[PDB]
Design a protein around this ligand. Structure first.
Ligand SMILES: [Ca+2]
Ligand SMILES: [Ca+2]
Ligand SMILES: [Ca+2]
Ligand SMILES: [Ca+2]
Ligand SMILES: [Ca+2]
Ligand SMILES: [Ca+2]
Ligand SMILES: [Ca+2]
Ligand SMILES: [Ca+2]
Ligand SMILES: [Ca+2]
Ligand SMILES: [Ca+2]
Lengths: 655, 655
């Protein structure tokens, strides 16, 4: 970087030189009128070139050489090392008139060289490298660079209700582990020359996106000073001489969102004092950029860590069977004494090269948010509509994510988020804009809308799920199918089982005496379910298109629905597709289907589809404690999973 | 694209087939219980494959072949040509039980094939190609594709005050020349089968960004029907059989801006009627994308078309000298009987492959906008602050643009917009956010802020300009320089000219008796101008950095300023840098400098700098009619230029 510093007529100029720049110096304006030629001297650590109309010649420290004074003959001045107390760094120019060799005037430039660099971990290894030339930009991909910042959305200590980033304070040194390091490195003499200061600053816009802390170690203990952030746009730095480093810690306050790309900047400037009432001049500025890490969800293929379960204390069969299932795995079981656990929360995560933690997204309200999961390295985020009203499609049974897929040659290494919606011209329900905008803004999961509004509850988890194919890297899409159910029931009827009773053992259903015959002879129900299969198939097509799936990737599970007053579907028997996936082990809702030879024909059919693939099926009964099934699921489960091995910053999302 | 169509148990399915897709067909669900095998027949124009667990085999029109019924044995159904009235397009499946070869049931699929394509000029040649596979995206660059739309911001007829895009109506066929063509091409039989319709639609969000018109030619004359746009989100299309095209014309209503990327979409869907109270199902959807063309400014290097001038009727010397100057060129002179022409307006342009026109940007208010330039192929756009108050930095003397430059290897083929500002920590003036956001959003001119707030008026045009180097492809940056002025005056003083008088012929200045001696002996004025040179040099450095310029690209013109109460600069004598550039011919403000040998030494110095380069200098006197110079320029000029030859869509801007 070339910087302009002119000699001053008759007088001397003192200037700070920042390493990494160089000066072009006009010697012509300072020359007295009528002066003909000039000569120069310079000190050992200052390199001087005479540049005549573009041609540069290096000049000795003490020469007698003279050049003609011209506006197009100038100096180029360079320094490679910072000044010390032992330094006298200078260039002096002597001027001569036509006759005589004794100087008629002199002008001089006194320099103090300093190093100033604001450094971050741009190369994404967790340590802060010295002056990465790419630190002022942010690029995606394995070859990409620029520093990454976490939203510090967890909570270090229990004594306050709020996430760490909601204030300007740090109470605990553990908090600094969540932050990104930024070091201001300087080198120079004992003090800056008179009239200079170094200042760190951010824009007003970024002031609600970041906070920056400095750690002091005074007499009575470590303390944490907020130097940049909400209502603090600049900080005057205390300069220390010699080679010095100041360590800062940076926290993100906000996720990427509608209107915020996630990128923020921090600057340091060397300022020069001019006069009173005149603003200080930014002599040198160095900038670093951070990108705030996105919130990322976890598909069912990922390794399970903890199974969170909610039910009533007396649903014993449910708790026993879930406990049994989880005992086949290495997962933790966590129980709370009832659908809020699947509907109100989605477990995501955030990651930076130095750290990562799980983060809960809280569904919009339910008159109160569930914040009780907020804790050390367990974060919280929520979005609420300002105007738009919430519907069932805002529940997180309506929020899921695919396994990694490749679609028309484009890879989605983190999978793609799936949310249920209605048709564009329908006037139907849709998830709130505020949540949709949030998911879209995270960018790395490239969300897809499916059609869920044909269902009364309206959730994608009612009709589809994903399971791994054991011993491989592949997966299957499972789809609810009414046609599969009618085919199976018609077969059992032909086989002599038409009088087989459903809902056996649910005493509240007994008086209805529902049999295969009764179901198959209901004409209006057949028509309704043909229509629901059209709805399922429309979704099948969107999923095949947007996930790059073929029929080879899909298994259909028998399902049956009943239509409500709105022409929307509710489950006739429990939806088996919405299942707990722990690797090869599947907790499947117990369907209570028609009994043939004392086994449920739905259970037997589903085992016949899944077991050959090495999937182990356990049927879980959540409804027996309620004595009947009306289409409503009472209990809930949510599985917190390990994050993807693939680092999100290694993706290259579309423009 | 694979689409799911199932056979129905016991009955026949009728479906529309859209060319460019194909069907996968489940024959298993429709099979009666106990059926063993199936056979199939199909018509001449329907291709049928039996797919058994992924392996596909083509099947004859009438075969007797039978396959085992399995959920994993399905059909793949393809058609390559649209149905006519002569068509019977069908597939029929027969089912068989274990014993006997006579079918026990049959299920069939009756097809009507149609072509539906919504087409635009994606390849950017001005004609609408048939089904460009890239029409649903928009990419930058010479290899890029996707269709382009102009904001239709001009006005076809004088009888209405408003730009064409402010309403939903088209009164004149000339308006259609500004719009982008979009054709819905279809092929099929005399009518769509019962229960289908074709509908065009847009999102609510895009409804204030576009309008779409269809031209009808009824008995009494051509008429223009608004089918999509403000308060019209969909249009049901009238289907015509055989091979048919419907031509639509699309207009943009809004420039890219903060929160609007410039991209918009239009969709066509084939909808299927299900029942009453049930939304129609989108069987097929085709999408095209448009990008709205950005507003682009013109640097001084571009060929001049028209010179717009404003002054008082009696400034005769000004009008004569401007007329003379323009007579050396091929430009039009346009006069209005005074700084508003440079301050209130910036002439830009817009371009699409089919058309382009100049567009005026109107500075924010001046209690009233200047709309009187609005006319046929001369457009208008303005931005007004909702909250923020306007300052002098919002005037368009503060809005300029560089010639094409390359900076650190990155090319800016349209140049870079330049606007004056204050330092980040200064609390100084800055152009309003609404205008800055607009300029940034156009993207192709990548704006740079300079430091203008050291000037009382605060405009970049006060201190810098660009001129072409005649007979080359190169250009120079011209900078105001106080050091150049002091050097020249000190030389003339040494030469015996200290008593040389400035402002000769301005009678209102005579009593002041301003001489070279008087100027040079004013100590406080020297200090002020040293400070102003620091301000100029700070700008010189930003310009060299952001435009990729060296000292070889820069000429300094003598200038002098006086400081006001705010420590800001006003011109001491007219600023010569702000000049009319018509190729090699330069109209330069007459400085009224000290007379030496009956010529102005400032004029002679400037000719000495510029004339060797082949630049022809004419000094233009706008102040003699006012008898004095207080630092204010009374007249104004603005030159409308030819657009860049380089097409903006061939650029590749940063992410
Ligand atoms: Ca590093
Ligand atoms: Ca805190
Ligand atoms: Ca924390
Ligand atoms: Ca933590
Ligand atoms: Ca969920
Ligand atoms: Ca074309
Ligand atoms: Ca109109
Ligand atoms: Ca028009
Ligand atoms: Ca026009
Ligand atoms: Ca301008």
């Amino acid at each position: 970087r070339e910087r302009t510093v002119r000699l001053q007529y008759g007088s001397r100029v003192e200037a700070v030189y920042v390493l990494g720049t160089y000066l072009w110096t006009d010697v012509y304006s300072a020359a007295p009128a009528g002066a003909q030629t000039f000569s120069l001297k310079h000190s050992e650590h200052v390199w001087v070139e005479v540049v005549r109309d573009g041609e540069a010649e290096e000049v000795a420290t003490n020469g007698k050489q003279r050049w003609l004074l011209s506006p197009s003959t100038t100096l180029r001045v360079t320094m490679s090392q910072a000044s010390t107390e032992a330094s006298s760094d200078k260039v002096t120019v002597n001027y001569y008139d036509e006759e005589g060799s004794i100087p008629i005037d002199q002008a001089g430039l006194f320099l103090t060289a300093i190093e100033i660099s604001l450094d971050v971990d741009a190369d994404r290894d967790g340590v802060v490298e010295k002056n990465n030339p790419k630190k002022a930009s942010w690029t995606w991909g394995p070859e990409g660079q620029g520093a990454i910042l976490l939203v510090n959305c967890d909570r270090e200590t229990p004594w306050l209700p709020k996430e760490d980033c909601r204030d300007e304070k740090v109470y605990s040194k553990e908090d600094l582990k969540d932050m990104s390091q930024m070091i201001l490195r300087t080198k120079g003499p004992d003090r800056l020359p008179a009239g200079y200061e170094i200042v760190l600053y951010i824009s007003m816009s970024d002031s609600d996106k970041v906070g920056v802390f400095y750690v002091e170690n005074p007499f009575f203990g470590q303390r944490y000073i907020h130097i940049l952030g909400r209502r603090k746009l600049y900080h005057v730095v205390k300069y220390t001489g010699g080679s010095a480093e100041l360590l800062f810690f940076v926290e993100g306050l906000c996720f990427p969102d509608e209107g915020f790309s996630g990128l923020v900047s921090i600057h340091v400037s060397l300022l020069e004092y001019m006069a009173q009432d005149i603003p200080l001049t930014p002599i040198f500025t160095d900038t670093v950029i951070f990108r705030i890490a996105p919130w990322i969800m976890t598909p069912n293929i990922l390794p399970p860590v903890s199974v969170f379960v909610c039910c009533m204390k007396d649903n014993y069969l449910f708790l026993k069977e879930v406990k049994n299932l989880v005992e086949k795995t290495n997962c933790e079981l966590k129980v709370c004494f009832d659908r809020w656990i699947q509907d109100e929360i989605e477990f995501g995560y955030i990651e930076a090269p130095h750290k990562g933690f799980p983060v809960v997204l809280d569904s919009p309200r339910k008159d109160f948010p569930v914040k009780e999961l907020l804790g050390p390295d367990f974060g919280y985020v929520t979005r609420e509509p300002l105007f738009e009203s919430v519907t069932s499609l805002d529940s997180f049974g309506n929020l899921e994510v695919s396994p990694p897929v490749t679609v028309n040659g484009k890879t989605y290494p983190l999978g793609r988020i799936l949310i249920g919606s209605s048709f564009p011209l329908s006037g139907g329900r849709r998830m709130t804009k505020v949540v949709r905008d949030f998911l879209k803004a995270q960018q790395v999961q490239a969300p897809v809308e499916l059609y869920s509004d044909w269902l009364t509850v309206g959730h994608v988890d009612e009709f589809m799920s994903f399971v791994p194919i054991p011993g491989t890297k592949k997966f299957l899409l499972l789809m609810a199918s009414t046609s599969a159910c009618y085919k199976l029931f018609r077969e059992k009827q032909k086989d002599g089982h038409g009088e087989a009773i459903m809902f056996k053992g649910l005493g509240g259903m007994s008086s209805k005496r529902i049999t295969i015959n009764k179901i198959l002879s209901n004409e209006s129900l057949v028509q309704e379910n043909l229509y629901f299969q059209r709805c399922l198939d429309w979704n099948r097509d969107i999923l095949k298109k947007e996930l790059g799936l073929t029929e080879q990737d899909i298994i259909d599970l028998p399902a049956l629905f009943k239509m409500d007053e709105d022409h929307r579907a509710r489950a006739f028997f429990p939806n088996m597709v919405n299942m707990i996936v722990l690797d090869k082990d599947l907790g499947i809702p117990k369907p209570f289907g028609p009994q043939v030879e004392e086994e449920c024909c739905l259970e037997m059919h589903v085992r016949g589809l899944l077991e050959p693939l090495g999937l182990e099926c356990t049927f879980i009964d959540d409804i027996s404690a309620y004595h009947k099934f009306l289409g409503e699921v009472h209990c809930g489960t949510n599985v917190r999973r390990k994050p993807f091995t693939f680092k999100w910053w290694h993706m290259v999302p579309s423009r």
